[PDB]
């Protein structure tokens, strides 16, 4: 069972190939602090048996939040909460990781269960194009703004390391800031940071480069990207392959291949494993390690995509919301004697 | 779906018919205090959707423990831990309950994963018969000893109420103290507390009576019994029916029908729902409310035993060790829109 074999990234060993995909809980305080919700939520899934927990999109600056209840990492005030969260994940048996994010032109929306409506924040982006009707028009960034955000990512990464997180993921996906620089559906700049493919990758690669310099090479840096945006004339798999080549040269350890979110009016052919082709192509054609994610719900499915060489790591999102001990039970289904906490041995 | 309809006991409303069966975690401190293990373990299952959590066998005196790591309730020192545990269960959406126990002649064994061997404690019992080879010979109780233990149960119940537990279960099952008084395989006394059926029930009914007086009538008192001991000439279903009649008259709200554990050398015909006949007979022939427990693992199974009138409450043990969110997912399988925490709505 490949699913339960260790994986070495940098000098870190993950004890299996299952990872908890970052999922916003919208339950931080109004200043982005860890609460009791996270301190129960995440350790539950570490006892559940994942090798790696990626903590949700954590905002590198206040206007980078998706909602007023998102986690933050822009102040030394965030460090005590984050350090405790990382400790509890670690003590429950999983490697603690965290996703650093800036929401860009999709910043400032209400929580999904309080309507999800935009709140009219002063959002920033590559070009002056609203995400959708009702959303504020973003203010195009200049080079001093780009520099300010890049340092917010760099300082976020440093703070995450001091908290004890051992895996940093940069969120360059789903139409948030860096994702929106990559796609021509949202980036229409005519300066060094729009038009060509090389220009569109320029700012995201600057952020990745700078974060890579502050994260020691024995700890993994992950990047998450929207591998296509599903739109007429948009970011495609071929562009992802080019972007992935650059990330590899620069020392990114793994590419977490998602898709969509740049614009709203597109056909997305949802099915089990529908983003696996992107991980597979990156892995096989570029030779960069990949994370597969997207409607992966079954042990036999997860093992099969690893057997096929379509990814190195399987990320699980929604299945771990409704079934947090999935990894323990998946072992049995694959003929592996599960390592369970001794308290629970008689349930297995 | 009966499984998701409320149940009224005394003046308490449980929001569904699923309950977490008491299960020793062997993770208290050496003085029987609540630790971090319980504070994560139990709230997880309350978020999982059970209407009622019964906290594990909690020892009414030190020599009543099953192991050195069992929870206790014999000192005001236990109250802060227990009060916090009851609070967190309650805040995660479940009614908090607790099982009061005395291990009797099976007291003082090592944790299951450290060998399970008897530790040679000075155990007490009805008669001078070891549980098995290697176990100490119990010291037969006299009436001052019986009185001392009865007050330990009474004071335990008072302390549990002050902690905020709203359901008290008395553990009179599985060959522990009170169970061992009921069965002739372990009770061979010739005084007022052995020989006849009425004598064998006399001490257990005194304990139940006295605890019922300190628990207000608007809060449920439950009793758990071994409905048969599976042994030649032992406690049988007919004896359970007689014992249940007495508990009903005295104001016990519910009988939690388990089986076995009095002696070791017996054939137990394990199968899904194998203790359901005992709950069914008590419920239908005595008219006392019952809890069904024992290899109940499936939503359709649980609903079916309720449809049949075999019980009022379904208790789940091992399934909640390996699958803590079972109740949320069971709703969907029965065509009920589950109430899930808003954070997890997209997993359902
Ligand atoms: C409630 C919710 C919150 C999410 N939050 C994030 C996030 O903060 N960052 C992110 O990259 N993806 C986020 N996602 C996307 C998931 O990480 C995952 O990629 C996606 O749900 C597909 O995997 P699944 O089918 O296993 O859920 C979220 C998804 C859900 C349903
Ligand atoms: C690890 C473990 C600990 C248990 N501890 C207790 C206990 O403290 N009190 C009790 O009455 N029953 C205890 N039981 C029995 C369960 O409560 C339950 O009645 C039994 O496991 C059958 O139900 P199940 O098939 O749903 O597990 C325990 C069972 C297990 C496996």
From TrEMBL, chains A, B:
A family per Pfam: Oxidored_FMN
Q: What cofactor is this protein dependent on?
A: FMN
Tell me the residue numbers annotated for binding FMN.
21-22, 24, 57, 99, 224, 295, 317-318
Q: Has keyword NADP?
A: yes
Domain (NADH:flavin oxidoreductase/NADH oxidase N-terminal): residue spans on this chain: 3-333
Keywords per UniProt: Flavoprotein, FMN, NADP, Nucleotide-binding, Oxidoreductase
GO terms (molecular function) for this protein are:
FMN binding; NADP binding; NADPH dehydrogenase activity
Q: What Gene3D superfamilies would the database entry show?
A: Aldolase class I (3.20.20.70)
Task: Quote the protein name from its UniProt record.
Answer: Chromate reductase
Gene name of the record: chrR
């Amino acid at each position: 069972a490949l699913l339960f074999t260790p994986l070495e990234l940098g000098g870190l060993r993950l004890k299996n190939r299952l990872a908890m995909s970052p999922m916003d809980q919208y339950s931080a305080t109004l200043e982005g602090e860890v609460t009791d919700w996270h301190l129960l939520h995440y350790p539950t899934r570490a006892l559940g048996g994942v090798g790696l927990i990626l903590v949700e999109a954590t905002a590198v600056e206040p206007l980078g939040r998706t909602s007023p209840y998102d986690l933050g990492i822009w102040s030394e005030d965030h460090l005590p909460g984050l350090k405790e969260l990382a400790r509890r994940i670690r003590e429950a048996g999983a490697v603690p990781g965290i996703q650093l994010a800036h929401a860009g032109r999709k910043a400032g929306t209400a929580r999904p269960w309080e309507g999800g409506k935009p709140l009219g924040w002063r959002v920033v982006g590559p070009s002056p194009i609203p995400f959708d009707e009702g959303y504020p028009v973003p203010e195009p960034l200049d080079e001093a703004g780009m520099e300010r955000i890049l340092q917010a990512f760099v300082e976020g990464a440093r703070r995450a390391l001091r908290a004890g997180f051992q895996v940093i993921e940069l969120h360059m996906a789903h139409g948030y800031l860096l994702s929106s620089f990559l796609s021509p559906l949202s980036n229409q700049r005519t300066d060094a940071y729009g038009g060509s493919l090389e220009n569109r990758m320029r700012f995201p690669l600057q952020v990745a480069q700078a974060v890579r310099e502050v994260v020691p090479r024995e700890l993994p840096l992950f990047v998450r990207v929207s591998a296509t945006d599903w739109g007429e004339g948009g970011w495609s798999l071929e562009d992802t392959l080019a972007f992935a080549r650059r990330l590899k040269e620069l020392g990114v350890d793994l590419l977490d291949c998602s898709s969509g979110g740049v614009v709203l009016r597109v056909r997305i052919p949802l099915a089990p494993g529908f983003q696996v082709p992107f991980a597979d192509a990156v892995r096989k054609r570029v030779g960069l390690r990949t994370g597969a994610v997207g409607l992966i719900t079954t042990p036999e499915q997860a093992e099969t995509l690893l057997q096929a060489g379509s990814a190195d790591l399987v990320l699980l999102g929604r299945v771990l919301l409704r079934d947090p001990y999935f990894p323990l039970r998946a072992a049995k289904a694959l003929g592996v004697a599960p390592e369970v906490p001794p308290q629970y041995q008689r349930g297995f």
